[PDB]
Each structure stands twice: as C-alpha cells, then as structure tokens.
Symmetry: D3
Subunit: 149 residues, 6 copies
Amino acid sequence: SQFFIEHILQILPHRYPMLLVDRITELQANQKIVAYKNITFNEDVFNGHFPNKPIFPGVLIVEGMAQSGGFLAFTSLWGFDPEIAKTKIVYFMTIDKVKFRIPVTPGDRLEYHLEVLKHKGMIWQVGGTAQVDGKVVAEAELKAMIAER
Amino acid sequence: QFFIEHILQILPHRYPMLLVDRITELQANQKIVAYKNITFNEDVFNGHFPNKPIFPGVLIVEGMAQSGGFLAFTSLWGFDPEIAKTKIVYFMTIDKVKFRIPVTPGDRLEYHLEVLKHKGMIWQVGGTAQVDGKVVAEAELKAMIAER
Amino acid sequence: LQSQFFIEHILQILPHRYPMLLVDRITELQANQKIVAYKNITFNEDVFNGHFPNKPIFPGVLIVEGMAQSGGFLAFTSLWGFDPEIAKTKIVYFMTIDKVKFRIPVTPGDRLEYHLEVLKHKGMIWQVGGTAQVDGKVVAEAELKAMIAERE
Amino acid sequence: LQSQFFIEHILQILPHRYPMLLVDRITELQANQKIVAYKNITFNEDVFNGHFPNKPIFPGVLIVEGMAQSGGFLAFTSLWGFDPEIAKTKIVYFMTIDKVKFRIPVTPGDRLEYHLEVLKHKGMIWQVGGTAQVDGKVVAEAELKAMIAERE
Amino acid sequence: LQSQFFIEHILQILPHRYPMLLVDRITELQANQKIVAYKNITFNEDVFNGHFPNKPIFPGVLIVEGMAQSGGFLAFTSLWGFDPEIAKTKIVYFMTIDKVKFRIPVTPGDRLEYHLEVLKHKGMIWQVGGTAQVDGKVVAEAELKAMIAERE
Amino acid sequence: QSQFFIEHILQILPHRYPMLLVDRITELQANQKIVAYKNITFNEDVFNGHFPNKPIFPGVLIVEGMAQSGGFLAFTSLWGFDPEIAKTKIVYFMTIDKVKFRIPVTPGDRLEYHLEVLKHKGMIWQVGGTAQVDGKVVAEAELKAMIAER
Ligand SMILES: COc1cc(O)c2c(c1)O[C@H](c1ccc(O)cc1)CC2=O
Ligand SMILES: COc1cc(O)c2c(c1)O[C@H](c1ccc(O)cc1)CC2=O
Ligand SMILES: [Cl-]
Ligand SMILES: [Cl-]
Ligand SMILES: [Cl-]
Ligand SMILES: [Cl-]
Ligand SMILES: [Cl-]
Ligand SMILES: [Cl-]
C-alpha cells in the first residue's frame, strides 16, 4: 500500500534531479497506483522555468506519471524486490492523449493517479491523471516495455 | 493567502536558500502560519545523507526564521515590494530548539511562529514546525532587518 | 526574417533559462511552415546525474520539451518576426501532446535535431508535429498544440 | 589518534556529502574533550546564489551545522577511533540547539574556524559548545546536542 | 583495442566525473601516437551561468582540460588497453601547459573536437600537443604534460 | 583602493557563479602587481568530479583565477574602481604559457595569486607570476590579454 522514498529508491533507477515521485499512497497489483511529488521553490528546475514565474514543467508531470506507472507495472509482477529491480528496466515507448489544464506551482502536492488500461507480457499500457487538491491538472496515456537491464 | 510570487516580492532569499513556499495565515504583530514542501528533488538530499534523505534540522530553523521574517516585513511596512527590495535579513540569536521527528521527502513542513517581542528592526519569534499535525521541531529566534 | 539563429537570438525570444532551455541553434526557419533546430547532448549536463547513474540517457520528455520550444520559437517569429521586446510579453504554453514515440535512446555526443512542421495555426493557437533526429535517424516523434499566451 | 586531519580523513568519518559537508580540515583534536577545525568560505559556493543576490553572506544556520559536524567528528573518533569501516554506516541527528548568538557576518574569503568543547557526553549523545571564529574574532557562539546513530 | 569509444567507455577509463568530465566521444585512436575526440557544447551546462550572463562562452581553460582528458584517455589505453579494473586505481595530474592560443570563441551548439598527438612519453609521463577544432577551423592550440598516478 | 572584497570584485569582473574564482584582493599597485586569493573548500561543485574521493582543485582553474586577477589588475590600472566603465569592457585572454604545477591544491587551502605586469603595449597586456599556498609556490604561469569593447 504505502511506499516511502527509501522504498522508491530501491525500485526505480532514477536519481536526482530526475526522481520525480516522493511517496506511494496506494497500490493495487495489475490495477492502479496513487503516488505524489511535492512541489517546492527549492528545485533547480525553477531557475529556468521560468525566472520570476515558477511553473512546474508539463513534461515533468508526464515523467512523474510514467515513473508511477513503471512502479505499478514492476511491483505488480515482482512485488517489492530490489534484487530483481536491478536486473530490469521499464522504458516508455509511447505517450498519448496528453492534456494540461492547470499550471503546477511551488506549494502544490502533485498527485499521480494511474490505472492499468491493458497489459500483455512485458508491454503495459497505463493511463490517468495528475491532480492537485482534487482537481485534474493533467492527463496522459503511456505505454511501457519491461526488459532486462 | 500569499503564494510564492508574493513571497519573492518580500523576502530577499533566493534559490537554494528560499525555504518557504506558501503563507496560509497572517496576523500582523501576532502570528504566521506558512509551509515548505519537502521533495526528493532538492540538492541538499545529495549530501544529507546519501541513501538516507533527511531534511536538515538547521534548514527547518531557517524556514522558521524566514516565516518570522515575512511576518516582520509586513507588520512593519505592509505588503510593500518597493521597501522590501532594499532590505536583507540577519540572524541574531537561536535558542530552545528541539528536534522530535525527522523530516523527509513527501512531507509538508508547516511553520507556526508567533511574535515574542519586537523593537524597530529587531524581531524575536518562537513556535514550532509541524508535519501532519505533529510537532517535529521547536525553536525561538531573533532576526534583524537591515538596509542592503 | 532570417533562417539561422544562434543562442544569442534564442535567449531574446524564449523565456526558458537553465536548466530548461533545450534549443542551442536554429538552422532552418520558414514562417508558418517549419523549423529545423538542434540541441547538443553532452555528459556535462546535470540531468545525467540522475538519468541514469553509469548509463546517461537523455530523458524522452526533454526531447519532447525541446521540440515544443522549437515550435514555440517558430510560432512567435511567424507572427511577430524577430521582436525581442514583444517576445518578453508573451509565453507559449503546452495545451496537448499526442502520438509521441521513442525509437532510439539519446546519449552524450549526440546532436539532437528538432524537425517541426506547422499542421494548423489560427491566431495564437498552433499545432505542430515532427521528429527529433540524430545523424539522419528518427529518435522520436511528437505532435503538440501550443498556445501563445500573455506573460501577465 | 592523530591531531591533524585532512578532507580525505573527514570524508571517511562523517556521513555528510556535497552540498552539506561543511568542514574542510581539522587542526587539533583531544579525544572526549575538544576539537578545532575549519571551513574555507568562497564565492564559488552554490548557497551564495540565494543568500543573498549581490550580497554574499554565509548563512548562520550553516555555521551551526559546521560546528555540529566538527563535534560529530570529535564524537565518533572519541568512540571508535579512526575507523572508516564502522563510520560508513553511521549518521548524525541534531537533537537540540541552544544559546546561539551571531556577532559578525561571514563572507567569501573568510576562513571559518570551529572551536568546540565537549560539555557532556553519554554513549551516542554528545553535547558540545563553542565558537566560530574568523581571524581570531568570535563570529558565532553555539551550544548543541547531537546523536550518532547506525543507519537502519 | 578499438578506434571508437562512447561515453560508457570513457566513464570506465577516465576518473573525471560531473562537472569535470569534458569528453563525450572518441572518434579516432592510434596507440602511443594520436587521438581525435570531441565534447558537445550545449547551453544546458551549469558553467554558462557564470561565463557569462547573457553571453555564453565556453571557458578557454576548459578547452585545455578537455584536450588533457583526451590525452589521458590515449595515455591509459596505450599502456593498459581497455582495462576498467586498473583504470579505477589511477588519477591524472597536470604537470605543465605550454604554447596555448585562443583563436575563436566556443559557444552553445558547437562540436568541440580535440586533436592530440604524442610528442613524448615515458612510463606515466605523457606529453601531448595539438588543437581544438569547430567545423574544421582551429579554435585553440595547446601543449601539455600529464602524469597518471596511483590513487594511493 | 588597495584592498577589495567580493562586493567590489563583482562590480568589476563580469564572471559569476561557478566561474568567479577570486574572493578578495589584498594588494594592488597600478601597472605593477596584484596579490589576490580564492578560498578552496570541499563545498564546491567541481569536487564532485575532480575527483571522487580525492578532491583536487583543477590546475586549469588555478590558471583561470590567475587570469582573472591579471584582468582586474589591467582594468583597475586603466580606469581604477569604475563599475560603470567595467560593464563596457572585455579582457580577452589570447595566450597562456610557461605553466608548471608543483603542488596539488585541496579543500582547506588559501590559493593566493601573485601576478605582475610583464609588458603593456596599447591594448595588449602581458602578465605573469605564481599561485601560492602558505608561502610556497604551487603553480606558475604567463598570460597575454587584450582590452576591448564589450
Ligand atoms: C538501464 O538502462 C536504461 C534505463 C532507462 O531508464 C531507460 C533506458 C535504458 O532506455 C529507454 C529507451 C529509450 C528509447 C528507446 O528507443 C529504447 C529504450 C528509456 C529509459 O528510460
Ligand atoms: C573588467 O573588464 C573585464 C575583465 C575581464 O577579465 C573580462 C571581461 C571584461 O570580459 C571578457 C568577455 C569576453 C567575451 C564576451 O563575450 C564577454 C566578456 C571576459 C573577461 O575575462
Ligand atoms: Cl510547461
Ligand atoms: Cl538533522
Ligand atoms: Cl526517457
Ligand atoms: Cl544569516
Ligand atoms: Cl575564456
Ligand atoms: Cl589538475
């Protein structure tokens, strides 16, 4: 159900400044994930996006959704297994139906809601939304392949 | 509420030393409630510590001092970016600080400061930092606002 | 309106700055039609510290972002030409992204070339599609709809 | 136990890393009693981008941090001597901070000297107090309690 | 010993890391004789934040550094071949630099090509000289002497 | 003036983080010599890569700090402490020669730049000297620069 940063670090190979999931609040195998990233001014991204107007990049929202969806796919098949995690990689083949509705800014808790749309073998198609305070800020569908590292 | 854009117009602190994201409550000469989001995507966590992200205790205090500073700026001159842009903030004293619970990525670090005493530019504040309604830290501090 | 633009000119048009300005040079520009630009990929970028240790792969979403910035440069200059003063008052936003395909990984040493074509434009609304290429090969494809909005 | 330690020795004892390793050299050390150490202050530090633009002032809270790290080096080597294999699985938590006064701003070009004395220690819990100094003058006073803990 | 090496190979031979690994790819290598390598130059490098605001220019001294690293890669693979096991036990020290000329500024979007030849070598001491080139034009010249030393 | 602090250096040199490599000027004699320094601390980004577990201040950046000191000397010799004119000038370094590194520089070192004017003819300034740590010569270099409009 709940995974904290330490758990996340053992599953995902992403490190600073490209690990964009802070906590997993909900996880149903083969079904859905709810996770989040806290948004703060204290992030290097905001130096350039943009000067005097801090806006969390929309592509990094999608990236966070992908990272959530990849975590869903991996743990669905192998559970919380750091040893297997090092032998596998989840890369993203496609991204589709992306819509941005509301700008994300420092102070926002950026929540990722992804469900498994379909899966066959190592090909997993996830989809859902990014949410701040109950509102949809973005949506996206993503297709991942799981492979050997 | 004051948002990051408003905070930037008052506090002189910038990246990577601006440690308040939003002001939720402000009562002139009385108290302030504010917060900073804690995320893994912060440079500090590279060194504090490897494989063990713990938000530095001294930076909790700094975030409290900045919250106190916002309260000080605005109690003094109201929301005035023009006056603000000439000033900086010096730490004078820190006392009676206790850390109870570690602060980690995914935490909403909420600052609760009240005015203990003030005179001119010298402001003494005290209160707590909280995560999910729990006190993670206590501190008292005195800061001075000065011309740049 | 020129067809070649260097970083000096890109900085005057785009509001993006480090570490989110992801276009280094523009090699072809045809108003309301197309842009060919590129970003150099080097190990000396902070992004590779995290993506990934011992295995530097340029993030696919940053390829898309770089395509969007190229598209945004094209959109603005198609309407106002090289006008830094007005550029300073405008900002281009992503509305949608569709049909994104990652074909080949991008790595240090690569010259990431953005090829964007104008699919539709009406006023401030611009639909662009195209590819990111390395040494003549398609590494990514994307379509996006952008909005030229007020900065304030 | 030696009395002088260099950055290599510090790295082998303290768990802190960039951008939070704030002790550069140890000049004297008496086990269970005192430590004198220092950190060089240069404009070439990332903190100075934010504290403050056009007026670089080394943050007071980081002076306290460096004093704590000095006490933590003293604490560890007093416990286990110079043992990097024991050290690499330890971390250090701040417990309390009291009676800190900042007297003089610290700026680029300063050699920030930490002088800590052990006020009380019991097991992993070390209470140190002292001063930070620049050119023989007290820029800061501080009392603090830190706990050494096994990473778990 | 092959002729082309990519970033993952360079990582395994050179001890340099971010932000001081300034070679992205090796295109040509003749043991004990010469090397052609390059670094891509992008705006997305932290160094351009300070060199200079509103005018990105790749520092001349860092061009020399990239040439030394190219020389160092040549030096090591000449003596040990592609041996990551032994590469881990070594660093490189600059001993001398001579005859350096800066002819053309290097900017974002440039492919910085390093051409170095061995002038003299004995044991760990390697003397190299050559040019840095962008689009076939000489941007810089330098001679340098380096030593491969045991990490101890 | 004879002594300049970081505030003054920022107003004369266009260099900024992470390429401003002079922290303070302790001596300045117009047309003759400059003594300046940069503090070396582990808390610098360069040390992440140069090298892991063995922090060594890059030799090329010693030379760079010497060049910066030479440029400050040249500029202040021509116009003194003038931030307004500073914004309109560049000091372009054309050549570097006779550089030798004797002792590695590490966190905790006070890197002192000793530079003197070797030749000044029109826009061309030729400067040379040493970098020192605790009175010992750690590096030496000669440099030639040209004054020009920004
Ligand atoms: C351990 O090696 C890795 C790790 C990754 O995160 C990734 C990878 C390889 O490569 C993935 C990829 C990207 C593009 C492509 O055409 C084929 C695969 C993208 C990715 O996220
Ligand atoms: C006080 O005036 C100075 C001093 C310098 O050292 C320098 C300078 C101006 O400006 C030079 C410069 C060179 C090229 C450019 O596009 C912008 C600035 C770099 C330099 O080292
Ligand atoms: Cl965006
Ligand atoms: Cl702490
Ligand atoms: Cl990717
Ligand atoms: Cl302070
Ligand atoms: Cl240069
Ligand atoms: Cl060196």
